[PDB]
């Protein structure tokens, strides 16, 4: 029933390095497991001169870490982004202050119950509390099942080893 999204976004200002320091999804089976299909961890945002966001991860599949790129398409609303990657259709950014942390979601629109899956992305590999209150203030009104979380060293590890 409607996910609140930030509303003056500004996507350049989000530029660089990230770090996934936390996630949580609808459905436990979308996160339990490194292979898990929403398991995925950002390691760079790169938004277009034209307003899109490229969004660079890493993925667990066939017993390794892999490389992977979603161009994410602009949309009426500043926060709100299109995809084709991981059975999703949206990215919705919740959230940010450019500089520590950002709060994004990813669903798909056609069945909005069993696809969401969020994360909290902090500019260094180090537990942000701050953030994480924040993360889990938003996700209050989310019907969320698996929460994850990641200390320093596993932020830095391929894939969060
Ligand atoms: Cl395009
Ligand atoms: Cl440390
Ligand atoms: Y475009
Ligand atoms: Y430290």
Known sequence: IVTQTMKGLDIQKVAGTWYSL???????????????????????????????LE????????????????IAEKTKIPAVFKIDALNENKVLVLDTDYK??????????????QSLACQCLVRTPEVD?????????????????????????????????
């Open 100 to 113: 520590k942390y950002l709060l994004f979601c990813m669903e798909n629109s056609a069945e909005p119950e």
């Open 22 to 52: 936390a996630m949580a999804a609808s459905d436990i089976s979308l996160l339990d497991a490194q292979s898990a299909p929403l398991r995925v961890y950002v390691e760079e945002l790169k938004p277009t001169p034209e307003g899109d």
């Open 55 to 70: 969004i660079l991860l890493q993925k667990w599949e066939n017993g390794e870490c892999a490389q992977k790129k979603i």
């Open 129 to 161: 509390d701050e953030a994480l209150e924040k993360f889990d203030k938003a996700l209050k009104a989310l019907p969320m099942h698996i929460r994850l979380s990641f200390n320093p060293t596993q932020l830095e590890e391929q894939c969060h080893i």
